[PDB]
Design an enzyme around this catalytic site. Structure first.
Site, short mmCIF file in Angstrom:
data_model
loop_
_atom_site.label_atom_id
_atom_site.label_comp_id
_atom_site.label_asym_id
_atom_site.label_seq_id
_atom_site.Cartn_x
_atom_site.Cartn_y
_atom_site.Cartn_z
N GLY A 1 -73.82 100.78 62.16
CA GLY A 1 -72.41 100.66 61.74
C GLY A 1 -72.05 101.66 60.67
O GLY A 1 -70.88 101.68 60.27
N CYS B 1 -71.97 104.91 60.88
CA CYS B 1 -71.32 106.15 61.35
C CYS B 1 -69.85 106.22 60.95
O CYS B 1 -69.20 105.17 60.90
CB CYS B 1 -71.51 106.38 62.84
SG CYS B 1 -73.20 106.91 63.20
N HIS C 1 -69.08 109.90 69.49
CA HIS C 1 -70.01 109.02 70.19
C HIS C 1 -69.55 107.56 70.12
O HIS C 1 -70.18 106.70 70.74
CB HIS C 1 -71.45 109.18 69.68
CG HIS C 1 -71.73 108.60 68.31
ND1 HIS C 1 -71.48 107.29 67.98
CD2 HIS C 1 -72.35 109.14 67.23
CE1 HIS C 1 -71.87 107.06 66.74
NE2 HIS C 1 -72.40 108.16 66.26
#
Ligand SMILES: *C(=O)[C@H](C[C@@H]1CCNC1=O)NC(=O)[C@H](CC1CCCCC1)NC(=O)c1cc2ccccc2[nH]1
Ligand SMILES: O=C[C@H](C[C@@H]1CCNC1=O)NC(=O)[C@H](CC1CCCCC1)NC(=O)c1cc2ccccc2[nH]1
Lengths: 304, 301
Positions: free
Chosen positions: B143, B145, B41
């Protein structure tokens, strides 16, 4: 966001842990530049632990009495001295992995990460608080001595704790990296009482803010209070005094939530007098006091 | 001994964390050998979040659309591919700090350490369990991920989790390093309900053994129960069923304490029916279920 007991990343510290052997006893050491720091009790024999005289014991040792191993490589000890309760072992090689660092002495209520070590090898990392009675509720087994507690500011590792002993109540006592015990404890296997502990009020308040930041609000009320009125109730529940400095440290959390400090105090007051009625805050059914305001900010703000 | 939510030392993983920027989205990547792993993503525009076709989105990307930074050193992406929900960026440099590693997929109830990271930079380490509903109660912010969950055995890091999203209830969802989500979740900004979470019974029992090992025994009883009797009560309290395997896994702890597993079950059943009543176990007023039997034996030995 979510909320968890969060330690600092331990990498910079794992690179300083070494194994220190003197005679039959092996404990962890902290290798910074060409100095290895370890508890002075390594020089003690079982027939000496009840009341050692460390100056006597250290005078009878030579450099070859200390084996220092960094992983598989043995470091040769070039000199040694004692600073309070820490032995400083000068070795012929400076640590290539030495981070930016300082030695700091923390205050009760403050938190730090502990890198629990055995044979110089890191085994786990957790978050601790210096209790008001100058003890820490750590997890340590035989051989953990010399494990260090630390905070990280950007690239700087602030060592604040070196582990020396377990009190009979099972809490732990240690020194700062200058060898000075936290609290009134001494490095002798003698009867030693930790004083009565108390709850770190400012941290309970910080944690209540973290709860609101994270959507747990059931404990909030429309009431306020004065510092002095709150502190009268705090004393009854074995809670530390709340000072204006504490109130001022809670400002940033107060600003982000829109809840006044003295309003949160009135919520805590009611929690104390009424309890949680089986309810939970941040996944805990007791008031957590091992999160400082800065801990809360950093975990709720993403500091790296 | 003392008992604490203990994480694995995180240095071996810190050495693998990188920043991965694609367009406007910046998240963390895991750099092992010549490959950088991150959530796919990262290639999603805010507009395409509700219903993305990652095969379309990745087809329209080139290697130069992926900015990988290891520290302040820029890594050159040589190839890219997609394995389920993780993007694999081949870079021209093999990570010098690459540990011995494996990718593993964990089961519900198993625990792992999470190295929360922002802009490739490690910010904090904490212990987690994979809940029965395949969600993790994490602590993550924008942030986060690409942050990885892991276990360390000897010198080997077993990567089991990569962070992808926060469910509306505030728990977190993610995938293994092969990009397969844990649970029924998908990487789309859609309404996704985590199933009803339940308590990991085998872990509660392990923690009660930790407690006995640490001198907390007020909850113990002279009563015993059969696994089927205990399970009849476990169901009523949203507790996971207990199996003979759980019983056997709890053997070592049963041995070191001399408390039979089904004796400890009789204690838990009474704790469930009566409650702690203001009492504490290992500093907790809740029954703790995020410590596996192995966690307990490692910390208590
Ligand atoms: C260092 O490796 C250990 C750390 C202990 C071990 C178990 N859990 C811990 O935190 N340190 C010790 O064992 C010290 C050694 C002493 C040497 C002489 C100077 C003081 C420390 N001993 C204890 O921590 C200790 C002994 C003892 C006896 C009875 C009750 C409590 C108690 N604590
Ligand atoms: O850094 C990556 C973040 C991690 C989030 C951020 C806040 N706390 C976390 O754990 N992921 C995200 O921000 C992902 C983005 C990504 C886009 C494409 C489809 C899959 C999801 N989005 C989400 O987690 C998200 C949560 C949520 C709750 C309600 C409504 C929409 C929502 N979206």
């Amino acid at each position: 966001s979510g909320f968890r007991k969060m330690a600092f990343p331990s990498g910079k510290v794992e690179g300083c842990m070494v194994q220190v052997t003197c005679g039959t006893t092996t404990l962890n050491g902290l290798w910074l530049d060409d100095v290895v720091y370890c508890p002075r009790h390594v020089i003690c024999t079982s027939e000496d632990m009840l009341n050692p005289n460390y100056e006597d014991l250290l005078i009878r040792k030579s450099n070859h009495n200390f084996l220092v191993q960094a992983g598989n490589v043995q470091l040769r000890v070039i000199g040694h001295s004692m600073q309070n309760c820490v032995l400083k072992l000068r070795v012929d090689t400076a640590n290539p992995k030495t981070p930016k660092y300082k030695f700091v002495r923390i205050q009760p209520g403050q938190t730090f990460s502990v890198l629990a070590c055995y044979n110089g090898s890191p085994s786990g990392v957790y978050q601790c608080a210096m209790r008001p009675n100058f003890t820490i509720k750590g997890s340590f087994l035989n051989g953990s001595c010399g494990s260090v507690g630390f905070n990280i500011d950007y690239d700087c590792v602030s060592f604040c704790y070196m582990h020396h002993m377990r009190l009979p109540t099972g809490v732990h006592a240690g020194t700062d990296l200058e060898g000075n015990f936290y609290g009134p404890f001494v490095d002798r296997q003698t009867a030693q009482a930790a004083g009565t502990d108390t709850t770190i009020t400012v941290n309970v308040l910080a944690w209540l803010y973290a709860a609101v930041i994270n959507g747990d609000r059931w404990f909030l009320n429309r009431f306020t209070t004065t510092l002095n009125d709150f502190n009268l109730v705090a004393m009854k529940y074995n809670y530390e005094p709340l000072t204006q400095d504490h109130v001022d440290i809670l400002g940033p959390l107060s600003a982000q939530t829109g809840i006044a400090v003295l309003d949160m105090c009135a919520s805590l007051k009611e929690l104390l007098q009424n309890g949680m009625n089986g309810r939970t805050i941040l996944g805990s059914a007791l008031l957590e006091d091992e999160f400082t305001p800065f801990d809360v900010v950093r975990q709720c703000s993403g500091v790296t």
